[PDB]
Short mmCIF file of C-alpha atoms (C1' of nucleotides) and ligand atoms in Angstrom, two decimals:
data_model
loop_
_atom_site.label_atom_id
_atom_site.label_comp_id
_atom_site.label_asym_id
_atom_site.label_seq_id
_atom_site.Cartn_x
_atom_site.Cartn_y
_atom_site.Cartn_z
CA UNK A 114 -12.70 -2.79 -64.53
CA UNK A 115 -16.03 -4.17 -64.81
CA UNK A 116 -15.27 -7.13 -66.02
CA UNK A 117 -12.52 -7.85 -63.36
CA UNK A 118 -15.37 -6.75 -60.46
CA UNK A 119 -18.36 -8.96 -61.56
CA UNK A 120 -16.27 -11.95 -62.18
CA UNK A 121 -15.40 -12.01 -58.34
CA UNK A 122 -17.84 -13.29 -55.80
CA UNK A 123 -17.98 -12.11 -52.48
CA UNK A 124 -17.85 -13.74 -49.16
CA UNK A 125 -21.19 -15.09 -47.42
CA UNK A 126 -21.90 -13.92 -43.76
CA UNK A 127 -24.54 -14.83 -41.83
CA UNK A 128 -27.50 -12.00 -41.26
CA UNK A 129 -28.00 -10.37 -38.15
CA UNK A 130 -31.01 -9.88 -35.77
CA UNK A 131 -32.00 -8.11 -32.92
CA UNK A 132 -31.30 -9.94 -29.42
CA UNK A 133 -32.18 -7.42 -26.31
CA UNK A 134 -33.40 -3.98 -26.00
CA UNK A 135 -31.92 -2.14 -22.77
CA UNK A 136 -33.51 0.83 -21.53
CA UNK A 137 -32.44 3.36 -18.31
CA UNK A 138 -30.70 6.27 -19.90
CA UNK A 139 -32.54 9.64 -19.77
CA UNK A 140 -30.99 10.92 -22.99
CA UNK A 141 -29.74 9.63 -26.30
CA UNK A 142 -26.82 6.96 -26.09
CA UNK A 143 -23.68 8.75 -27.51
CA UNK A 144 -21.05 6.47 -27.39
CA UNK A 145 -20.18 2.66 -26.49
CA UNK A 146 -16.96 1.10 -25.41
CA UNK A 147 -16.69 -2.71 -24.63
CA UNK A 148 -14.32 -3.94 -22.25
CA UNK A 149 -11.38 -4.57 -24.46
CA UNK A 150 -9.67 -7.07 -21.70
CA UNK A 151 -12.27 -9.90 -20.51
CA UNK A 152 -15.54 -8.60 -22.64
CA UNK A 153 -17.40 -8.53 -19.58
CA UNK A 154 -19.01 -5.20 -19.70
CA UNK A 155 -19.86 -2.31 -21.90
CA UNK A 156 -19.88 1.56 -21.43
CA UNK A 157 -22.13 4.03 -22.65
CA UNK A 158 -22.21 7.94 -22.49
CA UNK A 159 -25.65 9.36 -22.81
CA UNK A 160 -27.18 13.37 -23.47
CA UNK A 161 -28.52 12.85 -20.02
CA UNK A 162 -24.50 13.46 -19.03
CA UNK A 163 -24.18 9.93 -16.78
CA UNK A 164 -22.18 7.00 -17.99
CA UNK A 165 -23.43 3.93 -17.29
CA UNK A 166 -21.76 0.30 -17.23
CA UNK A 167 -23.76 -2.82 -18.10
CA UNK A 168 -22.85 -6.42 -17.57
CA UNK A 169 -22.47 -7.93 -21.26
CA UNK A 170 -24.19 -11.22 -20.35
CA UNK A 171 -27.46 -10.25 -18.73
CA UNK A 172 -27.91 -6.86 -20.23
CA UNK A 173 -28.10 -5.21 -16.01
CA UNK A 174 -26.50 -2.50 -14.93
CA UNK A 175 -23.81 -2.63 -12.68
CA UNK A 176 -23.54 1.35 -12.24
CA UNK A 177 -23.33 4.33 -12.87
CA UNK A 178 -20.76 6.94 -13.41
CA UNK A 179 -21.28 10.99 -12.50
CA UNK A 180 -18.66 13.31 -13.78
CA UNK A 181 -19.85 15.65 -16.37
CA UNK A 182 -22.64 18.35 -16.76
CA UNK A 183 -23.08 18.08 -20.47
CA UNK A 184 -23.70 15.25 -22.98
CA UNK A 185 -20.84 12.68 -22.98
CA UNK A 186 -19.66 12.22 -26.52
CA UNK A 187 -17.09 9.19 -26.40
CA UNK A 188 -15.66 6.93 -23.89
CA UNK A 189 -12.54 4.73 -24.35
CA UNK A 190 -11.11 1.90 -21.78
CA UNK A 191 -7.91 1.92 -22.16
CA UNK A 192 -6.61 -1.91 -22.72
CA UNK A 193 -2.86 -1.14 -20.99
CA UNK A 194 -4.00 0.43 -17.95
CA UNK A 195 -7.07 0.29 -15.42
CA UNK A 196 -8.47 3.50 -16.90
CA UNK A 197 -11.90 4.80 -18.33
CA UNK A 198 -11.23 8.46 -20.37
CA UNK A 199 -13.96 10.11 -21.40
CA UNK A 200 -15.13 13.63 -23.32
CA UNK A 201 -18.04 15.96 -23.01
CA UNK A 202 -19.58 18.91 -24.65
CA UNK A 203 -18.84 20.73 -21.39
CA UNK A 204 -15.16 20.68 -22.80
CA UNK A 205 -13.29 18.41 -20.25
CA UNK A 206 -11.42 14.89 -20.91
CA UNK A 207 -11.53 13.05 -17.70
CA UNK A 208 -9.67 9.95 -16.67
CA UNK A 209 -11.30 7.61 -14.47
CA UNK A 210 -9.58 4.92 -11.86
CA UNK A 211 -11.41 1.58 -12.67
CA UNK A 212 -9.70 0.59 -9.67
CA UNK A 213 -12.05 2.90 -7.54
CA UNK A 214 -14.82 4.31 -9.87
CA UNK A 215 -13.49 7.63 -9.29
CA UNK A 216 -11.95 10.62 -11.78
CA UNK A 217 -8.43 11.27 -10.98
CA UNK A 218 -6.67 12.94 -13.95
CA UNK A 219 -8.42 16.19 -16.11
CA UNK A 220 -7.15 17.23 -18.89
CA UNK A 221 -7.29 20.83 -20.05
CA UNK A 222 -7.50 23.13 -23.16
CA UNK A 223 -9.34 22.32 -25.61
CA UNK A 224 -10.98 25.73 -26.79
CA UNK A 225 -14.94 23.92 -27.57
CA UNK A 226 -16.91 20.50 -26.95
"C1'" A B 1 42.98 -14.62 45.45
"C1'" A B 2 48.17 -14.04 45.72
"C1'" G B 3 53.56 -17.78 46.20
"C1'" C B 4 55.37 -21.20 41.73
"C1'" A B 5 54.86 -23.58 36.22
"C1'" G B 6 51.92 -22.32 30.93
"C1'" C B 7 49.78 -18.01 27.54
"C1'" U B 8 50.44 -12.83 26.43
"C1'" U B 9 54.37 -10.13 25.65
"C1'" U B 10 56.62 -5.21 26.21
"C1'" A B 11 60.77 -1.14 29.11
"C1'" C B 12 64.67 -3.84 28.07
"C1'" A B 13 69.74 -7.25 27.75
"C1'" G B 14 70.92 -11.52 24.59
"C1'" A B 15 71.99 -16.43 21.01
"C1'" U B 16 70.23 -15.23 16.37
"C1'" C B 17 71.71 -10.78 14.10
"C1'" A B 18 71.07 -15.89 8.58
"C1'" A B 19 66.75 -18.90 6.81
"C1'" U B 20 61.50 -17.88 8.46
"C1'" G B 21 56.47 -16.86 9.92
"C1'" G B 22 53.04 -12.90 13.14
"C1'" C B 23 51.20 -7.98 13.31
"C1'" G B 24 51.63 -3.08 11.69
"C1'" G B 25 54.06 0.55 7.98
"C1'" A B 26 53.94 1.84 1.48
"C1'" G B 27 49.55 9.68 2.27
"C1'" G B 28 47.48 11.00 10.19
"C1'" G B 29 43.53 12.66 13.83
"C1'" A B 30 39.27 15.69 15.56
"C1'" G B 31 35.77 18.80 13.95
"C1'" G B 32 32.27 22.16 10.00
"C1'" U B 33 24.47 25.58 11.14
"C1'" C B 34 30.00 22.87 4.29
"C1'" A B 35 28.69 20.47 -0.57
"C1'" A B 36 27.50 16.38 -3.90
"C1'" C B 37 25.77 11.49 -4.74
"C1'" A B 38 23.20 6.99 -3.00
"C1'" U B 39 19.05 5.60 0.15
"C1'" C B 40 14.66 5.80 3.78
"C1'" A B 41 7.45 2.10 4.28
"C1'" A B 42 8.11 -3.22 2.42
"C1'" G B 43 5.41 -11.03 1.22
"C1'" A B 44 8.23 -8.65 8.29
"C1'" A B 45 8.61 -6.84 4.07
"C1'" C B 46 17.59 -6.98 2.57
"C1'" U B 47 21.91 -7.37 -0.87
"C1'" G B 48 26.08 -9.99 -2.81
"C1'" U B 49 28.08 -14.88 -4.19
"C1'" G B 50 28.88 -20.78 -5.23
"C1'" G B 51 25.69 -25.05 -7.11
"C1'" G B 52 20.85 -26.53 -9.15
"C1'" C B 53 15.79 -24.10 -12.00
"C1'" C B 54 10.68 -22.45 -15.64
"C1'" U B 55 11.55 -18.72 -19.73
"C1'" U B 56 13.56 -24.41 -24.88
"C1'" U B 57 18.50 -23.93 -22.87
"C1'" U B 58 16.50 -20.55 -17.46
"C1'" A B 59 20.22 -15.55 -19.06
"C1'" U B 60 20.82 -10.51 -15.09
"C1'" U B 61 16.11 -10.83 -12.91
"C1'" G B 62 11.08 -14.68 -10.83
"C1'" C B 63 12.19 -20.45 -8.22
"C1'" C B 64 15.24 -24.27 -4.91
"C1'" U B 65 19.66 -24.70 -1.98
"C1'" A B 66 24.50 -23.33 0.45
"C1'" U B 67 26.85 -19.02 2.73
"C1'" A B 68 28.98 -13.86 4.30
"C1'" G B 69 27.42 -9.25 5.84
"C1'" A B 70 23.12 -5.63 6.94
"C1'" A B 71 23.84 1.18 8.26
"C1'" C B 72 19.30 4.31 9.17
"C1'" U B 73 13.59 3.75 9.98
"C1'" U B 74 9.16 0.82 12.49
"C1'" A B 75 4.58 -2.50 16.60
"C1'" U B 76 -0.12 1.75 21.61
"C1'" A B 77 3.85 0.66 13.59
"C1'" A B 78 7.37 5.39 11.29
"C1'" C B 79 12.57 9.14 8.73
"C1'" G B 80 9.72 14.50 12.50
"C1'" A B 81 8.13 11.99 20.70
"C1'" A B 82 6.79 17.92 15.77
"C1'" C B 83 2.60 19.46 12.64
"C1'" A B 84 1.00 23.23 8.00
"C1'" U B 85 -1.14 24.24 3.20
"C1'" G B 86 -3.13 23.02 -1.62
"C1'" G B 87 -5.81 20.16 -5.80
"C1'" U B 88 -10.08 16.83 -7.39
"C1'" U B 89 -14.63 14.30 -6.14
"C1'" C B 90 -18.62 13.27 -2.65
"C1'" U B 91 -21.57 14.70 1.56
"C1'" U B 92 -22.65 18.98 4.91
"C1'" G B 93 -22.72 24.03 7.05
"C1'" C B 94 -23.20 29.39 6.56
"C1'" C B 95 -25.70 31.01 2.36
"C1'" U B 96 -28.56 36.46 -2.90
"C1'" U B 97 -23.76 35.02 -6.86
"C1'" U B 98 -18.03 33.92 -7.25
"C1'" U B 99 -13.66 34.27 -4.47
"C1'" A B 100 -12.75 33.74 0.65
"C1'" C B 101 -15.09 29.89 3.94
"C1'" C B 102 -18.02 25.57 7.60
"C1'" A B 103 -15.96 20.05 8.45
"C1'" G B 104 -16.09 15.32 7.67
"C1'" A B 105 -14.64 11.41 3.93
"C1'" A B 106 -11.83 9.35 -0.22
"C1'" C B 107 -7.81 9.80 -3.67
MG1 MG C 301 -22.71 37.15 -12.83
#
RNA sequence: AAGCAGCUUUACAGAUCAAUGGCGGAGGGAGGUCAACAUCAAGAACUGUGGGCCUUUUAUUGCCUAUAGAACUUAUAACGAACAUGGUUCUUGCCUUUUACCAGAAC
């Protein structure tokens, strides 16, 4: 087994490094979705309970989304439909109309966060 | 517009009483505070069908063109010359808390 593993060489990638540094949430950032049709914005949930969407390119913030009263722990665009779900520690799952920037769909029963 | 000739013919009477074609007949009408199914808000916005058309063979759909038929609804835009309630979110009001609510919006 050793043998077979050290003769192999692995693939090179280039390293990373740090580009921009965005600040303007209030809490921790929880969760990140990129826009998983055109790549032109990003998501992020926050322990400060907001979402907020930021244009990709310049790093601003295009706005912000108000729907739960506890930390939101994931977000997920959906790349089928015009829709934004997202989760909380308040114990909702909430679909949002990208269409309009507005919930329209709750989902209930889940017992915790 | 009536008197006469042409069209229509029918209550009839014929040649014909054969060979034809025309229009009907081979399960009636009016109703029901009966039922089921289909359909009713959209490029002013409809479906079938003949020929041509991108999907690599245009199929059944979307496009061009020819043509027959469109019931209901609608422009001081809606089936309803009528008019209720509820959910979510936002902003208000009353407000000691929730229900029940104040009244505007959006979906
Ligand atoms: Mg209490």
């Amino acid at each position: 087994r050793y043998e077979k593993l050290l003769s192999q060489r692995p693939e090179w990638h280039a390293p990373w490094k740090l580009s921009r540094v965005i600040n303007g949430h209030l809490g921790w950032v929880r969760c990140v979705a990129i826009d998983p049709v055109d790549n032109e914005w990003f998501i992020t949930g926050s322990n400060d309970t907001t979402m907020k969407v930021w244009d990709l390119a310049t790093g601003k913030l295009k706005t912000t989304l108000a729907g739960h009263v506890m930390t939101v722990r994931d977000v997920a665009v959906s790349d089928r439909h015009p829709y934004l779900f997202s989760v909380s520690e308040d114990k909702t799952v909430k679909c949002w109309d990208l269409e309009k920037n507005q919930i329209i769909r709750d989902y209930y029963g889940h017992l915790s966060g």
